[PDB]
DNA sequence: ACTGCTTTCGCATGAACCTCCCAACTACTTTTCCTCACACTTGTACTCCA
């Protein structure tokens, strides 16, 4: 799932940028805001997590 | 007695089905998701009523 909602939200970003004239380091900070995310989700035990 | 009913035969060689289970077309359950409203209880505000 984390695979795909990456790669739409990679989608989204990259329509941004390309047709409503945001800079580019728009997805640089996106990035860390999507990690941090991602340490939330590695942060729950495994078994069981039900990352919202 | 001659009755009936048998029966064996034939020109070479060449070519000359029945349930049953799977299909279409629907519906209704399946197998996990995220998204809040509700019921109280301590709290702070109110104005007393003698």
Same mark, same amino acid.
């Given at each position: 799932?984390?695979?795909?909602?990456?790669?739409?939200?990679?989608?989204?970003?990259?329509? #941004?940028? @390309?047709?409503?004239?945001? %800079?580019? +380091?728009?997805?640089?900070?996106?990035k860390?805001?999507?990690?941090?995310? #991602?340490? @939330?989700?590695?942060?729950? %035990?495994? +078994?069981?997590?039900?990352?919202?």
């Amino acid at each position: 799932f984390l695979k795909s909602f990456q790669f739409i939200l990679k989608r989204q970003i990259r329509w #941004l940028i @390309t047709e409503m004239r945001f %800079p580019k +380091e728009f997805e640089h900070v996106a990035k860390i805001i999507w990690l941090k995310i #991602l340490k @939330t989700i590695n942060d729950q %035990p495994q +078994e069981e997590l039900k990352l919202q």
